Amino acid sequence: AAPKAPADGLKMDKTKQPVVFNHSTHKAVKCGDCHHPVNGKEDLQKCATAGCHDNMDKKDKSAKGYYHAMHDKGTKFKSCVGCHLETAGADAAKKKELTGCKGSKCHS
Ligand code: HEM
Numbered sequence: 001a002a003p004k005a006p007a008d009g010l011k012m013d014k015t016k017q018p019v020v021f022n023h024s025t026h027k028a029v030k031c032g033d034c035h036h037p038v039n040g041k042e043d044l045q046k047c048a049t050a051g052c053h054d055n056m057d058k059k060d061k062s063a064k065g066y067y068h069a070m071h072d073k074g075t076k077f078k079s080c081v082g083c084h085l086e087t088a089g090a091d092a093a094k095k096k097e098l099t100g101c102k103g104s105k106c107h108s
């Protein structure tokens, strides 16, 4: 059957700055905008699976860079921060909540 979203409260914890991901706040986003095509097939593996976004060098801006995939603009798929920047627009409160590097809903 079509895959179902998991429970809220999923911790992304590849790094020492873990972030909690809630599917319930991301329903307006098609599943494949995140679990994106790889070889033409929407891929439901963990983002940092070997051969995926497995480089824990936060300086790497090639596709395999995990930090890059979560923070950067101009990516083939929207990143967490990229989409949130667009969402917040000029609203400073939303910029803080959704894009702040600290004291945000990502990095609380
Ligand atoms: C769309 C309704 C949708 C589905 C289906 C889906 C499924 C899904 C599963 C099954 C997992 C768990 C994977 C595992 O084995 O741990 C999972 C995890 C994450 N998802 Fe998801 N997901 C759906 C939608 C979305 C959307 C729209 C996004 C992006 C805004 C998204 C993101 C994530 C993230 C991040 C994770 C955690 C993966 C990781 O830490 O490696 N999902 N999803």
Ligand code: HEM
Binding pocket: 034, 035, 036, 037, 038, 039, 043, 044, 045, 046, 047, 048, 049, 051, 052, 053, 061, 062, 063, 068, 069, 070, 074, 075, 076, 077, 078, 079
């Ligand atoms: C996990 C939900 C997950 C996220 C989030 C994610 C994001 C992501 C972005 C933002 C890009 C674009 C980067 C750029 O520099 O343009 C991107 C690109 C690729 N990804 Fe990814 N990705 C997630 C999951 C996965 C998984 C599970 C794999 C490996 C099976 C994977 C692989 C790739 C590849 C390859 C690319 C480059 C585009 C292409 O060659 O297909 N991603 N991802």
Ligand code: HEM
Binding pocket: 019, 020, 021, 022, 025, 026, 029, 033, 034, 070, 078, 079, 080, 081, 083, 084, 087, 094, 098, 105, 106
């Ligand atoms: C990438 C894996 C990613 C993360 C991490 C993330 C986090 C996140 C948080 C913490 C919130 C606040 C709500 C909550 O506590 O769950 C939030 C809210 C929104 N997001 Fe997000 N988000 C990630 C990815 C994406 C992507 C790729 C998009 C757009 C394509 C997106 C969008 C949104 C929207 C919209 C919201 C709600 C905003 C509001 O004002 O409440 N996110 N996300």
Ligand code: HEM
Binding pocket: 012, 013, 014, 015, 016, 017, 018, 019, 056, 058, 067, 070, 071, 080, 081, 084, 098, 099, 100, 101, 102, 104, 105, 106, 107
């Ligand atoms: C603001 C532009 C901002 C910064 C800077 C930032 C930094 C940061 C670091 C240093 C890490 C850990 C990297 C490492 O490997 O040690 C990290 C990790 C994640 N972040 Fe972040 N972050 C900034 C902003 C945001 C925002 C607003 C979100 C959510 C939209 C977000 C998301 C993430 C995710 C996801 C991770 C990985 C969590 C994990 O797997 O441990 N960041 N960030």
